[PDB]
Write a structure and sequence with these properties.
This is part of a larger assembly, with seven protein chains of seven kinds.
Chain C lengths: L6 H13 L3 E5 L3 H6 L25 E5 L7 H9 L6 E5 L1 H4 L21 E3 L6 H15 L23
Helix pairs in contact in C: 1-5
Chain D lengths: L2 E3 L11 E5 L7 E5 L7 H4 L5 H7 L9 H15 L5 H29 L5 H19 L22 H19 L1
Antiparallel strand pairs in D: 1-2, 2-3
Helix pairs in contact in D: 4-5, 5-6
Chain G lengths: L8 H33 L15 H9 L14 H14 L26 H22 L3 H32 L4 H12 L2 H20 L24 H23 L14 H20 L6 H28 L4 H16 L4
Helix pairs in contact in G: 1-8, 1-9, 3-4, 3-8, 4-5, 5-7, 5-10, 7-8, 7-10, 7-11, 8-9
The chains are: A mainly alpha (160), B mainly alpha (427), C alpha/beta (166), D mainly alpha (180), E mainly alpha (117), F mainly alpha (95), G mainly alpha (353).
Bound molecules: Piericidin A (HQH) and iron/sulfur cluster.
Piericidin A sits at the interface of chains C and D.
Chain lengths: 160, 427, 166, 180, 117, 95, 353
């Protein structure tokens, strides 16, 4: 825990700082892949194992691969082009960036929770009956949503 | 089994459009929407629930409203792309689930399922339409992130993600606020309204109709489930109504002005959130949906891309009945006797006073008095001198739709004691 | 670091380079077909270590100048020589490359030694594939430092080590 | 993608530069650039003996060379009125079709290798070497043979030539039929 | 389930593999003539512009990858049914089959419209 | 508890991005970071309140993938012809 | 890992180093033996040269690889150009310890494998994605779009058939119900050779493993014979050695996994000897894939994507649905023997028309 907890949280935080700070898009994306790998490791540390592996397979393996595909097809790596900088928009937004933490920190400040439950590892063997079961209706809704997103994007590009 | 109609017809048409002609696709979409609407009518007072899917008066009424709006906006769209209809069906289902569950995560899934297809529906290729699509998409994804963090803090306050939780102190308030963020964003409440002017100006007018009716209907339906505190409600209402009407005065274009007006109208609607009457809000949103569908059908018949105020003038000489219906809609949306908008507004104000919020109600009413300036500068213009103006005076389809909308509005204005009885359990 | 500074070290690295020589194709003319025939299924340059053939120049150490080097081809080959990593050797295959051959004209470089340092010359028109094998055995003993010319001089391992490339 | 498929690259046989205009995986249109092999036969041949030019003729189409040799020979023969002996002309057509087969063998090896697998380059090419042995028996040369002459041929066929030829004409048809 | 010790052994596997790889990189880098040339650093193929002046590459790869993220989400949903099935009975089979059929209907759409594009 | 504070910090960082990033795709990446911070908070509260948040976060990832696909399609649609994805060149729609 | 024991950490590191160096020497000698097998195929014979039997030429090749001026291309990225090969090798070497070479303790006491994770197939899937990551990353960092499009082809094709890998691996889990490799192998020990039950998915796995760098998409791509591929064309000393090493490591990893999952992972009905049968099946699938290397043409990666997408993956998911029917209804297992036997006889008898 704490030995690896602090280090993993530092890796996560620095990766996020990079992905929101770095102007080299490729560098931000790979920092974010590091973010997700450390995040899946932390998931394992949280007895949630299945979700971390899907996180790595889906997000890293598939999604941000497509991010990289687009930004290599469409260069777009250095966003620092076409500025209209609006200097005052940099700090104020950044200021707002901090604020949205504090209230959340306030919502979590002075909070204690019961972190003692027999998860037995977040294996899908037990997640199935929840997914297929209490969540099965949600599952069908989500699958329909995915199909609708496919058709929306296709008709959105659809040169003819 | 309305969900049955929606899902089956949608999935079937998905493939069937390849072999079936777009005219047949239109007729089939019409039949699917009409069958879902008939099923909704026949299930009056017949709750049907499986999981998070929970059909009550809220789901029933508000999804009826969404189906009416969808039917109307489909009747008008004639583009030679079948896809431009299928997505609407999808959206319908999503908004249904938005009202038909308390489950925050399924609420998010339905919110996305309704927000996506409209984005593509706003792509008439119009340079402002595409700008609207991108702004709408980014802001909607941000609001969905906010709603997700709210559901996370909800699960922090309780072991389940279904609304109705007991609720802790600051954690429960923060989760409620984070949910309210996205919900009011989709409800055009300030300070989360900013997408609305750009989107309503840029999006194709019929899509603007469909959005401003169904999206807001389902959003308020789900809002009734929230435990919205009075203070946050006060701030949202104040900002929403102030910004809406005040910025509306300065608009010279119909669609954007109506967007700010819809901000004001949602601010008025938010009063039922004080009590969650779900009857007053049902009636209010019925009136607003009808009037909005009528007015936006007029706007669509004029020009989908953009309709300025001056072009609207003289419509009476162009079409007398259409101008009269638009004026009646402007009056009903002003909240004037003896029209149903006044009954909905009165019901909301009564729920607010029952909640004991006084200065907020006073400010809302003063701003409503402000609204009459532009509401009249548009409604009465129907009689002005005809300028050269795009005028395609529709088929009898849209004419009869407008007629029935206006008649329903005025009838429920004179006799609200007919449908208002059946917004609760449904006697 | 350049394969030097210990008697065992340079002999061993020269061993490695000598028997691991990988050819880089430079097809110009009919010398190229008999260059290919040094690989066919009667006679393969696939035993000495040259089975695989990296067409990329960033991946092969031996360059076989096979054919008449037309002058419009000079900078290309020029760059190809610089677009090879530094441990590179250049074999001059055929008459047209080594000398002007029967095509003694405005159109052909009369010796590829003009643009790139020639390591080995091998006449023939076309040189029998086995003659190319003998040229590469000569190059084998060259990069080992086991090669001598007619005057008694002990040739250096790598040509293109004596030039101020630019 | 105004791409520069350069001379000799990527392993494009017949050194040549191509400026391929292309978007994606189709091929819109290729602008060629040639001359990277210009040797200047048409000039150098004006400075070599008529006998000497038979050395220059094969080195141009180094796959099907004997057609070049025969075309030049025939032109000169017509020019000065020479007679090709029927045995000599028969041997000439033999050499012509034999170089034609060598050309087709290398052609199919290079083609099949160019896209697909590397194997089919070997087998047929083995036979090519075998064919060359035949030439090596008669002309003493792999290719670029200076054999033909205006009146006829350089010298006679060895006694050992016909058996190798009959051996190849018997074994080859089954090979070709199996590839087919 | 599995003990966490195997996962720390996995981390050690990765750490030793990474260290050995970085060592191999150092070996490759240190052993070299190290005489760069301005042309040596040139991209490729005769002077400039191996590809050089080219416009953006086709969207077909984007379509494949977007398809792939969605269908890997699909397989992520299908795996929990793959493990625990008999306890889920005909109800579980029916849910997973309807799910797969919806997403494959979307796929049939993209197919009958096709992406050679 | 460190996990939940970490989720809050990562969400704040993703907001910092969405406010800061000029390019649509970098904004989109910041949004991804926001959603995954939320999912981390969900996993923490699932460890606390009994594992439901795992299936919750799975559904979250699926929904995110759908909206990402559609948003990338739209981003391509607008800035295939157009110059840099920077939103500042999109200001025709004004009050 | 319900019942499988755990060695101390130092033994884990010892075996990790042994597996790294073993895969090293393995792909080196496999380059040798593939050259000789190709030669045996293409009449031409191999290097009875500098060996004697050839088994010392790769050391000369490695000594060539070093000293070969590891070059940092200017006008190309300083960092990622160097970085990508390390990714491609690190995330390839691992995921081979999982392949069980024997029952527990059959490593003379301690562990045949290295790690026996509960979610093994997911580990394989994840680490498979990162190879493509490194491939197309290096394709980009080279800054010569000549190789960029090749790396794009690589990623497109491998990702398509890697999607197919999921629908392929779905089917057996329903029967097994466990995601530990040794359980599935013991399953094929008792009930017998899972492919007999699940033949069709095996094909779309095999084709995937043949599409995933074995050969015949042959739009992998390699620089030769086409628009040159990614992951090469700019690296000189060790980085190209790393790319070739990782590609061949994936080659033998798939060539070992195919008998491991579907067919008889070592665990033979006869003599139950731990290592030799697994190594021999590795060699068998390796020789079949090399046969294919020599014996079949290209697929252009567009018709290849169409083929995998429209035909392979629907077949895999449909087979998953049928196996799910059988498992959820659970009545027979002989139905599966009959069904897969029919499927293979269909795919076989349909040829000689
Ligand atoms: C797996 C495959 C490999 C490792 C390699 O790619 C194979 C082994 C390499 C080969 C075959 C060599 C190629 C050299 C070449 C392309 C020369 C140019 C050329 N070629 C011709 O065709 C023969 C010509 O005749 C019309 C020419 O005139 C000219 C100038
Ligand atoms: S030396 Fe002879 S075989 Fe070689 S290129 Fe010149 S003419 Fe052709």
């Amino acid at each position: 825990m704490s030995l690896l907890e602090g280090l993993a949280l530092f890796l996560l935080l620095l990766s996020g700082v990079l992905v929101v700070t770095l102007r080299n898009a490729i560098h931000a994306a790979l920092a974010l892949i590091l973010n997700f790998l450390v995040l899946a490791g932390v998931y394992v540390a949280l007895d949630a194992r299945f979700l971390g592996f899907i996180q790595v397979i889906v997000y890293a393996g598939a999604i941000v691969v497509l991010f990289l595909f687009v930004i290599m097809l469409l260069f777009a790596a250095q966003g620092e082009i076409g500025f209209d900088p609006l200097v005052r928009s940099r700090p104020l937004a950044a200021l707002l960036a901090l604020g949205v933490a504090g209230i959340l920190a306030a919502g979590l400040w002075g909070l204690d929770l019961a972190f003692t439950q027999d998860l037995k590892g977040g294996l899908p063997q037990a997640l199935g009956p929840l997914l297929y079961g209490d969540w099965l209706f949600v599952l069908l809704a989500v699958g329909f949503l995915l199909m609708a997103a496919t058709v929306v994007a296709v008709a959105l590009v659809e040169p003819g | 089994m309305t969900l049955a109609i929606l899902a089956v017809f949608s999935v079937a048409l998905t493939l069937l459009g390849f072999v079936l002609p777009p005219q047949g696709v239109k007729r089939a979409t019409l039949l699917g929407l009409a069958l879902a609407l008939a099923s909704l009518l026949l299930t009056w007072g017949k709750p049907f629930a499986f999981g998070p899917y929970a059909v009550d008066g809220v789901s029933q009424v508000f999804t009826l409203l969404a189906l009416l709006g969808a039917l109307w906006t489909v009747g008008l769209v004639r583009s030679g792309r079948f896809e431009f209809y299928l997505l609407v069906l999808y959206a319908a289902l999503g908004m249904h689930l938005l009202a038909s569950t308390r489950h925050l995560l399924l609420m998010l899934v339905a919110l996305e399922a309704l927000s996506l297809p409209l984005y593509a529906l706003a792509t008439w290729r119009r340079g402002q339409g595409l700008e609207a699509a991108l702004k709408y998409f980014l802001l909607g994804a941000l609001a969905a992130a906010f709603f997700l963090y709210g559901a996370a803090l909800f699960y922090g306050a309780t072991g389940s993600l279904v609304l109705g939780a007991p609720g802790e102190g600051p954690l429960y308030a923060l989760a409620l606020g984070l949910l309210l963020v996205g919900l009011g964003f989709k409800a055009a409440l300030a300070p989360f309204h900013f997408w609305t002017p750009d989107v309503y100006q840029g999006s194709p007018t019929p899509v603007v109709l469909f959005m401003a009716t169904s999206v807001k209907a389902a959003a308020f339906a789900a809002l009734l489930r929230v435990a919205a505190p009075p203070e946050a409600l006060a701030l949202l209402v104040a900002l929403s109504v102030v910004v809406g009407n005040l910025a509306a005065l300065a608009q010279k274009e119909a669609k954007r002005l109506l967007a700010y007006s819809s901000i004001a109208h949602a601010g008025y609607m938010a009063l039922a959130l004080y009590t969650g009457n779900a009857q007053a809000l049902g009636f209010y949103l019925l009136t607003y949906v009808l009037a909005t569908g009528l007015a936006f059908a007029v706007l669509s018949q004029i020009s989908p891309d953009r309709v300025p105020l001056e072009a609207l003038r003289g419509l009476y000489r162009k079409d007398p009945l259409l101008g009269l219906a638009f004026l009646v809609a402007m009056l009903s949306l002003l909240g004037l006797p003896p029209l149903a908008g006044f009954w909905g507004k009165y019901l909301a104000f009564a729920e607010a006073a029952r909640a004991g919020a006084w200065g907020v109600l006073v400010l809302a009413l003063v701003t409503s008095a402000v609204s009459a300036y532009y509401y009249l500068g548009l409604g009465l213009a129907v009689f002005a001198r005809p300028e050269e103006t795009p005028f395609r005076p529709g088929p009898p389809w849209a004419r009869a739709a407008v007629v029935a909308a206006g008649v329903l509005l005025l009838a429920l204005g004179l006799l609200p004691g007919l449908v208002l009885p059946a917004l609760a359990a449904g006697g | 670091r350049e394969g030097i500074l210990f008697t065992t070290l340079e002999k061993l690295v020269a061993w490695g380079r000598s028997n691991s020589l990988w050819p880089a194709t430079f097809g110009l003319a009919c010398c190229a077909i008999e260059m290919m025939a040094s690989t066919d299924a009667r006679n393969d340059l696939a035993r000495f270590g040259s089975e695989v053939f990296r067409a990329s120049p960033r991946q092969a150490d031996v360059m076989i100048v096979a054919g008449r080097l037309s002058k419009k081809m000079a900078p290309v080959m020029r760059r190809v020589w610089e677009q090879m990593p530094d441990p590179k050797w250049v074999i001059s295959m055929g008459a047209c490359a080594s000398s002007g051959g029967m095509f003694n004209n405005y159109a052909i470089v009369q010796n590829v030694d003009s643009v790139v340092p020639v390591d080995v010359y091998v006449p023939g028109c076309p040189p029998r594939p086995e003659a190319l094998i003998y040229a590469v055995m000569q190059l084998q003993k060259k990069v080992r430092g086991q090669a001598y010319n007619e005057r008694g001089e002990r040739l250096p391992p790598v040509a293109a080590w004596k030039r101020t490339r630019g | 993608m105004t791409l520069n498929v350069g001379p000799q690259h990527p392993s494009t046989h017949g050194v040549l530069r191509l400026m391929v205009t292309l978007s994606g995986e189709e091929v819109l249109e290729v602008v060629p650039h040639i001359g990277y092999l210009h040797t200047g036969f048409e000039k150098t041949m004006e400075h070599r003996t008529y006998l000497q030019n038979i050395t220059y003729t094969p080195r141009m189409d180094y796959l099907h060379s004997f057609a070049h040799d025969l075309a030049y020979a025939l032109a000169v023969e017509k020019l000065l009125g020479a007679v090709v002996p029927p045995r000599a002309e028969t041997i000439r057509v033999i050499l012509n079709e034999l170089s034609r087969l060598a050309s087709h063998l290398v052609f199919l090896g290079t083609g099949l290798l160019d896209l697909g697998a590397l194997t089919p380059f070997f087998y047929a090419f083995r036979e090519r070497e075998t064919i060359l042995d035949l030439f090596e028996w008669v002309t003493g040369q792999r290719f670029h043979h200076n054999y033909i002459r205006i009146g006829g041929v350089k010298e006679d066929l060895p006694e050992e030539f016909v058996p190798e030829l009959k051996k190849l004409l018997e074994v080859l048809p089954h090979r070709i039929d199996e590839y087919e | 389930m599995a003990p966490i010790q195997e996962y720390v052994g996995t981390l050690i596997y990765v750490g030793v593999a990474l260290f050995i790889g970085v060592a191999a990189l150092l070996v490759g880098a240190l052993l070299g003539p190290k005489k760069p040339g301005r042309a040596k650093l040139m991209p490729y193929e005769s002077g400039n512009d191996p590809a050089g002046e080219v416009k953006r590459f086709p969207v077909h790869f984007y379509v494949v990858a977007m398809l792939f993220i969605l269908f890997d989400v699909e397989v992520a949903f299908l795996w929990p049914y793959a493990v625990s099935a008999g306890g889920l009975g005909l109800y579980g089979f029916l849910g997973v089959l309807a799910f797969t059929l919806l997403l494959f209907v979307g796929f049939l759409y993209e197919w009958w419209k096709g992406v050679m594009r | 508890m460190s996990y939940l504070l970490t989720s809050a910090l990562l969400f704040a960082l993703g907001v910092y991005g969405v406010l800061t990033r000029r390019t649509a795709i970098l904004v989109f990446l910041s949004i991804e970071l926001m959603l995954n911070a939320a999912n981390l908070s969900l996993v923490g509260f699932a460890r606390a309140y009994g594992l439901d948040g795992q299936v919750a976060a799975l559904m979250v990832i699926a929904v995110a993938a759908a909206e990402v696909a559609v948003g990338l399609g739209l981003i391509v649609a607008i800035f295939r012809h157009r110059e840099s994805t920077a939103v500042d060149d999109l200001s025709e729609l004004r009050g | 890992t319900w019942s499988y024991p755990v060695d101390p950490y130092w033994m884990v590191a010892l075996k990790a180093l042994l597996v790294v160096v073993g895969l090293l020497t393995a792909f080196a000698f496999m380059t040798l033996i593939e050259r000789r097998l190709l030669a045996r195929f293409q009449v031409r014979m191999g290097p009875n040269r500098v060996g004697p039997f050839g088994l010392l030429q790769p050391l000369a090749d490695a000594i060539k690889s070093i000293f070969k001026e590891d070059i940092v291309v200017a006008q190309a990225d300083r960092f990622l150009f160097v970085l990508a090969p390390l990714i491609s090798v690190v995330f390839a070497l691992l995921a081979f310890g999982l392949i069980p070479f024997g029952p527990p303790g059959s490593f003379f006491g301690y562990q045949p494998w290295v790690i026996n994770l509960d979610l093994g197939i997911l580990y394989l899937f994840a680490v498979s994605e990162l190879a493509v990551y490194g491939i197309f990353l290096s394709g980009w960092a080279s800054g010569s779009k000549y190789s960029l499009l090749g790396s794009l082809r690589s990623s497109a094709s491998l990702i398509s058939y890697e999607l197919g890998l999921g629908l392929a691996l779905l089917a057996p889990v329903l029967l097994v119900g466990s995601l530990n490799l040794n359980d599935i192998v013991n399953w094929q020990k008792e009930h017998g050779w899972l492919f007999l039950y699940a033949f069709p998915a095996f094909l779309v796995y095999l084709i995937a493993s043949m599409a995933e760098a074995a050969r015949t998409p042959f739009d992998l791509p390699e620089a030769e014979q086409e628009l040159v591929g990614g992951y090469h064309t700019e690296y000189s000393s060790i980085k190209w050695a790393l790319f070739q090493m990782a590609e061949y490591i994936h080659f033998i990893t798939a060539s070992a996994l195919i008998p491991t999952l579907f067919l008889g992972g070592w665990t033979m009905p006869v003599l139950e000897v731990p290592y030799l049968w697994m190594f021999l099946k590795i060699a068998f699938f390796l020789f079949f894939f090399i046969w294919i290397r020599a014996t079949w043409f290209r697929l252009r990666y567009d018709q290849l994507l169409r083929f995998g997408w429209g035909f392979l993956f629907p077949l895999a998911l449909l087979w998953f649905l049928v196996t799910a029917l059988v498992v959820a209804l659970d009545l027979p297992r002989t139905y599966l023997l009959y069904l897969s036997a029919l499927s293979f006889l269909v795919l076989l008898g349909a040829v000689l028309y």
